[PDB]
Amino acid sequence: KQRFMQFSSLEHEGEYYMTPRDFLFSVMFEQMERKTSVKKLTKKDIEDTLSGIQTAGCGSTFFRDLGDKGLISYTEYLFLLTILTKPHSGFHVAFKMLDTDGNEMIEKREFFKLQKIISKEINTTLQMRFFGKRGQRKLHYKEFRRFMENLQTEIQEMEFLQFSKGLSFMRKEDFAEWLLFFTNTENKDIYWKNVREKLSAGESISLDEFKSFCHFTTHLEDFAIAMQMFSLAHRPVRLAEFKRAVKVATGQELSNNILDTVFKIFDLDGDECLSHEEFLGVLKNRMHRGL
Amino acid sequence: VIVTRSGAILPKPVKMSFGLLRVFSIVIPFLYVGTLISKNFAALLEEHDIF
Amino acid sequence: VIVTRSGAILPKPVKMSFGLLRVFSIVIPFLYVGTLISKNFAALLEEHDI
Amino acid sequence: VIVTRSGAILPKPVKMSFGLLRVFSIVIPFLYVGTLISKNFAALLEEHD
Amino acid sequence: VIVTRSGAILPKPVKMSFGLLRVFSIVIPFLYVGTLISKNFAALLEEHD
Amino acid sequence: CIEQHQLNKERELIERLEDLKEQLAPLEKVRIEISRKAEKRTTLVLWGGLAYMATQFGILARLTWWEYSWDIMEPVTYFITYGSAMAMYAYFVMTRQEYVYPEARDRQYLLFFHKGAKKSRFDLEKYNQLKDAIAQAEMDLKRLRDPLQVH
Amino acid sequence: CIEQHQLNKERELIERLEDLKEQLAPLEKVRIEISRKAEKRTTLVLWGGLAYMATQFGILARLTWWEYSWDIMEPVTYFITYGSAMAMYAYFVMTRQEYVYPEARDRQYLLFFHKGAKKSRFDLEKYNQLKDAIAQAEMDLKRLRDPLQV
Amino acid sequence: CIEQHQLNKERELIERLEDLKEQLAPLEKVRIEISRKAEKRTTLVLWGGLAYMATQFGILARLTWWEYSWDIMEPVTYFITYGSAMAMYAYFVMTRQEYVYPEARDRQYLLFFHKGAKKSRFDLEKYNQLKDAIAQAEMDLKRLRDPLQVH
Amino acid sequence: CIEQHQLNKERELIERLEDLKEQLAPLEKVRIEISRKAEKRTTLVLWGGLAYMATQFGILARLTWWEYSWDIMEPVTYFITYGSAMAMYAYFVMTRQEYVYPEARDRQYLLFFHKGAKKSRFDLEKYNQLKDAIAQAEMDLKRLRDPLQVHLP
Amino acid sequence: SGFRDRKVMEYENRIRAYSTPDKIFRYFATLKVISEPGEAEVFMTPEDFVRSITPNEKQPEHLGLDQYIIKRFDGKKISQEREKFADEGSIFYTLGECGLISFSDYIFLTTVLSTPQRNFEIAFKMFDLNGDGEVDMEEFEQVQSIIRSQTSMGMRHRDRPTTGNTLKSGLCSALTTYFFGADLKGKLTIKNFLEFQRKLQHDVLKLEFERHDPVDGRITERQFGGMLLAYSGVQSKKLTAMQRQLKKHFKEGKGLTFQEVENFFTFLKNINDVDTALSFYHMAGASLDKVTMQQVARTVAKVELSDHVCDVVFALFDCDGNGELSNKEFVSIMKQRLMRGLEKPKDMGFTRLMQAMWKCAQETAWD
């Protein structure tokens, strides 16, 4: 909210705007030394939106082909936050309700009144893209879900590459140190404890398992219900049940080193078991990103 | 208790004449009144007014 | 025992200052206070439960 | 209540000989025979009904 | 009760010194033991039957 | 001489006893009739209380078997048994003495006795004053006629 | 005028004590027997009361654990308690005496002593008369010896 | 050498009774002040006991018949009475008393009266000392009537 | 020789009092130590009663809200409260008095006092006799020194 | 009406809220069939099962508690065709009797009905030997052990009625009759179990519909709304508000067939998602109107809706006759009617508040 004003880039009619790159900085970094300066919007900018859109790759390479060639309003920024933090916060619902009477092909005029209410003139790149150059088209639901997928995937790509420290992969501790950018407890010292002691550190781990991990963190309450079954059943959580719990959270399965490292952090007075509610809380301090 | 300080036996304890059948004939009518009074109160209660 | 040792008769028993229309008047407000805070307790059980 | 006006400590109180057994000898079989006529009452009342 | 035959003042009755601390410090452990031994009794008797 | 003098003191003392028995005679018959009257009123109170308990038994006896249920009337039952103890504590504080059956029955009979006396207006005070006088003269005549000590 | 009178009075008082203790033995020889049978009948009453307690306990024990529900016998077991309170009040209004245990056993003791006094033609009237005279004489000899201490 | 002893001692003794009375006279008004200042507090705590009994009835009334069952309130019902029978036993352990209500208010009044005297620094010991001496002299004069008249 | 005889009588009674107090002192020590022994035991009994009163309530508290229902425990509480009066009646059948708390307290203290007497085997009958003789000597001296019955100028 | 009737309704709503479930089963059951060698068992009708669920409803005076219509069936008497209480093809028919329901079966239906589908998804897919919900009888007992530990937290075992391990054998009767067949060898899928739940819910709902005597299969609008408002306090003022608002319109004689209410209650299985949709229709300036109600419903749950149903639904939940619906009031009353008064029976909420105060004690023990 105030970070939009902290990370604004352009100025039109007093309106602060963000570039895609300043948005990248806002999602990767909380705040920086960098000034995030504000310049006045010339009318090249409403053609910079076009000239970036005429060139950029429309999937998981979008902002990094843009860089600064884009427009993000405050409501659009909050919408981007809602994308990256709140999946299934109403997306099939919106295309059912905002432009009904047929298929799920939404109209541009319900676009703007979209932006404000889910979060609770010139064009940006979004309605320049989704509806065509001036609103000639309608946005497709499967295409928008693909957009959600490759956009959130592009966030994962940025976190991977910026947090690979130049590597091709993430190590175990690269990934777990990544995993503790949003953890601030008093057992955090305990949580770092198994980092410096009970960790076979290194062990480079690819991006696809990281993607699987992120999608695991999406479908999370079902994992909460399964570990609640394991709360109201005295069968302790070993490796096969935890694998099975990840699979029934997803329909997909994963690495070992991710999984064993989760065990090693979250034994915590239960030997070779998962500190499961505690692990959920760690992932939701990860997911809330500060509130 | 049963012996006086004079070492003597107490006077004879007294009862109530017909008091046994007084109890045996006072409980029974008033138990029947307790039977009667709720019968003639509750049907009245659902007769007259239900607030 | 109403008769003393000497055959005399014990004094008048002392009722206290129209009790029946003041003890009756003090059980009721404390009982209202009780039912009020019990209702308050159930609602607070819901509130801190929330 | 322990001593006299003289402070003389009062004599030892009486206890009936084997008396705990004398009362435990009466508590139990009367319980048992009441338990028997429980069955005798219940069986006959389900017999009439 | 208050006064004597003489109309004197009866003395202050003794309090069992720190007895309030004593009575709750004896209520609490036998509360917890009545909890404990009957948890034991339940955990055994479910296994018997 | 001390003989006829001390026997004359004895004789005047039994004369004084005769006067004390004499003056009691016209007064005593209002006390006896009041006592018998408040006696029947206490008798009505006691059998009235037994009649009450049979009534309160009979109400629940009607309802809770076979007019109705038992699991509905158990709160009414407990609240009645608790209110009984409440009213007993009240009868302590509303009297500054304890509720134990004969020592409240005698309170009620005493109350009815003074109730009849207030209507009667017969100088109960001078009556039991005279009673203490005649019992004192009784003990005087007891002590004066010691068999051990010659007089 | 005392040494003559107490020289008479000691001797005559021991004479009265001797004569009354002669009188007492035929009555007391009956008193022991009647008191004994009274004590036997009263002790039988006490153990029968405990029988009543245990028997009521057992019949109400079997029903609510094997044959009937507690849920349909909770009212009866309320009503026997309330009837017991009514029985205490009935004992009060019948005896003009509080229902408490030693007073009750003394009440029944004197009843089942005086039935025996009826059935044995016992001179209770003479017995308590003798005990009164002996108590008087004992007071006299005590009040004789105590100024003898002065 | 026996009777003028009694006459001069009797004059002296009623004189000493008068001195005991006059030495009492400034003191016992403070005793009656402390007698109020304790007794009003004790009446406050007894009417407070009745009020607590009222609230304990009322919270149970509301907590059953508008919030919950009886069958999820019949337990706490039972545990309150069991706690009361436990508490009176604790009272008997604390002070050796049966906890009967006149003995209850008497021990409570003694606790308030000694704190009331000690805060007011009342010489209780000189009070009851002097009261006992007064009572001894009064029973002496009640004796000194009788063989000086009845012999 | 009136007053010398009188003061001789008083001296006689008061020195009998002195001698009997002199005999009172040695046995009173054993009496007071066996008193504090049996007092320790009976104070333990007084507390152990409340310990029983609490450890019943712990059982009955756990067993209705955690691992059985009140449908289960309610008949048990009925039979406990009935056996309460049944034991209090059986106590009166045992010993010839009621179940009253200070009364039974004195009973148990005195019963432990005689248990200590039978162990230590001290002279309780001499103690009784001497302790009565002291108090009678005091009361008769109280009669003696009346300033309304002056014997001592 | 009727003061005794009102107090009985108090009492039985206290029962259906807060009693113990064995005593509940002993309350509403009416039948006691004598296996003439052994003894009699206590079963209840599907009608009694409904009244065991349904608030504000009573059973006649000689049923009461533990006072049964005693139906001696099997023994020396030649029993050819016993009494088909349930229709054939009822779920209640398909269990181990010809239309009777045991105690264990009552616990089983209270579990399966009053539990969301998602929880059974996870429940099958956790203990299934595979991770794929293909479940044997042993893991099914595990499922029952875990989920009977959800609603009826206060359970017990008197061991006189079917509380004991015979609970497991009536469960076995259900499987051997219907789930695993004769052999008890195969497994049961997720889908067939959820199909079973849905059909069970439909049969319960058809009996709940049936108890009103729908003349020509059609319910009084007032009686319809009263069924819609079963799990509630007293909303009779809103009932008459819907009535008098409808007493403007000329629809109140038209009734409602079973199919519409069937459709709407299937729509309620999706309505807990369109809290979002109606919530965004709040701030988007559009008005809560019956046309868009049935349009939105035919989009999101794809179930058809007559105007008459939404007339009654609106006139109930409109803002006291102002012509406008209210969002979250309606959402909460639909979640209340949906959950059927489930969460925390036989409350001891002070235990949870004691745990909460100790968590605050631990939280100040961080200080």
All partners of chain I with 3 or more CB pairs under 8 angstroms: D, E, G, H, J
Chain F CB contacts of G75 under 8 Å are 64-65, 70, 73
- Nearest chain B CA: its distance from F4 CA (Å): 36
Statement to judge: residues J199 and J228 lie in one domain: no
Taking a C-beta distance cutoff of 8 angstroms, is the pair F16, F23 a contact? no
Could you give the angle at which helices A276-288 and A207-218 cross, rounded to 10 degrees?
100
Tell me how many degrees the CA angle F125-F130-F134 measures, rounded to the nearest 5.
150
What separation, in Å, do the N-terminal and C-terminal C-alpha atoms of chain J show?
Answer: 58
Residue of chain B nearest G31, judged by CA positions: B9
Q: Which residues of G touch D28 (CB under 8 A)?
A: 54
Q: Hey, which chains touch B, using 3+ CB pairs under 8 Å? A: F, G, J
- In whole angstroms, what separates CA H5 from the centre of its chain? 41
Residue A39 dihedral angles phi and psi, to the nearest 5° = -110, 155
**Which residues in chain I belong to E strands, given as ranges?**
none
Strands (E) located in chain J: 31-35, 39-43
- Say if residues J345 and J154 touch (Cβ distance below 8 Å): yes
Nearest CA in chain C to H63: C38
Q: What is the DSSP string of I20-64?
A: HHHHHHHHHHHHHHHHHHHHHHHHHHHHHHHHHHHHHHHHHHHHH
Residue E32 corresponds to which amino acid?
Y
Q: Is there a contact between A274 and A209 (Cβ–Cβ < 8 Å)?
A: no
Least CB-CB distance to B38: which of F50, F54, F63? F63
8-state DSSP, G63: I
Q: How was this structure determined?
A: cryo-EM
Burial G1-28 (b: 16+ CB within 10 A, else e): eeeeeeeebeeebeebbeebeebbeebe
What per-residue string of b and e applies to A51-68 under the rule 16 or more CB within 10 Å gives b?
A: ebbeebeeebebbbebee
Q: Enumerate residues 6+ apart whose C-beta is below 8 A from F113.
A: C2, C9, F34, F35, F38
Nearest CA to I109 out of I40, I32, I27 is that of: I40
Distance CA J230, CA J57 (A): 10
Do the bridges between strand A105-106 and strand A139-140 make them parallel or antiparallel, or are there none, so unpaired? antiparallel
Are the Cβ atoms of G47 and D26 closer than 8 angstroms? Answer: yes
- Euclidean distance between CA atoms I148 and H146, whole angstroms: 13
3-state secondary structure chain D: CCECCCCCECCCCCCCCCHHHHHHHHHHHHHHHHHHHHHHHHHHHHHHC
Longest CA pairwise span in chain A (Å): 66
Helix axes J307-317, J327-339, angle to 10 degrees: 110
CA distance H20 to J62: 84
Phi, psi of A179 (to 5 degrees): -70, -20
User: Within an 8 Å CB–CB cutoff, is residue F67 touching chain H?
Assistant: no
Comparing C-alpha atoms, which of H101, H126, H127, H103 is closest to residue H32? H127
> With contact defined as beta carbons under 8 Å apart, do B21 and G128 qualify?
no
- Residue found under tokens 């004895």: F10
- J293 belongs to a structural domain: yes
Backbone torsions φ then ψ of A239, nearest 5 degrees: -70, -40
Per-state percent for chain C, helix, strand, coil, to nearest 5: 50, 5, 45
CB G64 within 8 A of CB I75: yes
Q: Which helix (H) or strand (E) holds A139?
A: strand A139-140
The CA distance from B31 to the nearest CA of chain J, in Å, is: 23
Q: How far is CA E28 from CA H81, H83, I57, I66, in A?
A: 19, 14, 11, 19
Give B12's contacts in chain G (Cβ within 8 Å). 110, 114
Q: Say if residues A202 and A174 touch (Cβ distance below 8 Å).
A: no
| Residue A34 DSSP label | S
From the number of C-beta atoms within 10 Å of its C-beta (0-12, 13-18, 19+), residue J14 rates as buried
Interface test with J, best of G68, G69, G73, G74 (most J CBs within 10 A): G69
> How far is residue J173 CA from its own chain's centroid?
22
- Report how far residue J196's alpha carbon sits from residue J178's, in angstroms, rounded to the nearest whole number: 10
Q: Which residue, among I152, F6, I148, has the nearest Cα to H142 in the 3D structure?
A: I148
What whole-number distance in Å separates Cα of residue A250 and Cα of residue A265?
Answer: 22
The runs of H, that is alpha helices, within chain A are: 2-6, 20-28, 45-53, 62-66, 74-85, 92-97, 109-119, 125-130, 141-163, 172-179, 188-196, 207-218, 221-229, 239-250, 257-265, 276-288
Structural element, H or E, at residue H5: helix H4-24
Measure the CA–CA gap between J266 and J202, rounded to whole angstroms.
Answer: 9
Encoding tokens for residue G140? 């006299």
Give the DSSP per-residue string, B21-46.
HHHHTTHHHHHHHHHHHHHHHHHHHH
By the CB < 8 Å criterion, does H69 face chain J?
yes
* Cβ neighbour number for residue H53 with a 10 Å cutoff: 19
- Whether F75 sits inside 8 A of H53 (CB atoms) is no
- Token couple for H138: 């009064």
Beta bridge partners of J135: J188
State in Å, rounded, how far the first CA of chain H is from the last one: 17
- Residue F109, both tokens: 């009979």
Closest to J308 in 3D by CA, of J220, J210, J216, J213: J220
Chain H, 112 to 151: residues with Cβ < 8 Å from chain E are 113-114, 117, 124, 127-128, 131-132, 134-135
**Residue H89 carries which side chain, given as an amino acid letter?**
Y
Name chain C's partners: 3 or more CB pairs within 8 A.
Answer: F, H, J
Asked whether residue J257 is domain-assigned, the answer is yes
Note whether J43 and J101 are within 8 A (CB).
yes
Residue identified by tokens 């008047």 is C25
Backbone phi and psi for residue J322, each to the nearest 5 degrees, phi listed first: -80, 0
Tell me if residue J98 falls in helix, strand or coil: coil
> Do the beta carbons of residue B5 and residue G128 sit within 8 Å?
no
Say which amino acid occupies J166. T
Nearest C-alpha in H relative to E14 = H95
Phi, psi for residue G97 in degrees, rounded to 5: -170, 140
Structure tokens, D23: 């009362």
3-state SS assignment for residue A194: helix
| Residue of A73, A20, A46 whose CA lies nearest to A134 | A46
- Contact C37/H61 with Cβ under 8 angstroms? no
Where helices occur in H63-100 by DSSP H, the ranges are: 74-94
CB atoms within 10 A of CB A180: 18
Residues contacting H69, CB < 8 A, separation 6+: J14, J15, J17, J18, J19, J346
Q: How far is CA A71 from CA A22, G122, I11, J33, J139, in A?
A: 11, 126, 125, 78, 56
Q: Is residue J226 included in any domain, yes or no?
A: yes
Contact F55/B at CB under 8 A = yes
| Rounded distance between C-alpha atoms, residue A261 and residue A267, angstroms | 10
Cα separation, E7 vs J165, in Å, equals: 75
List beta partners, residue A10: A17, A39
J131 and J225 both lie in a single domain: no
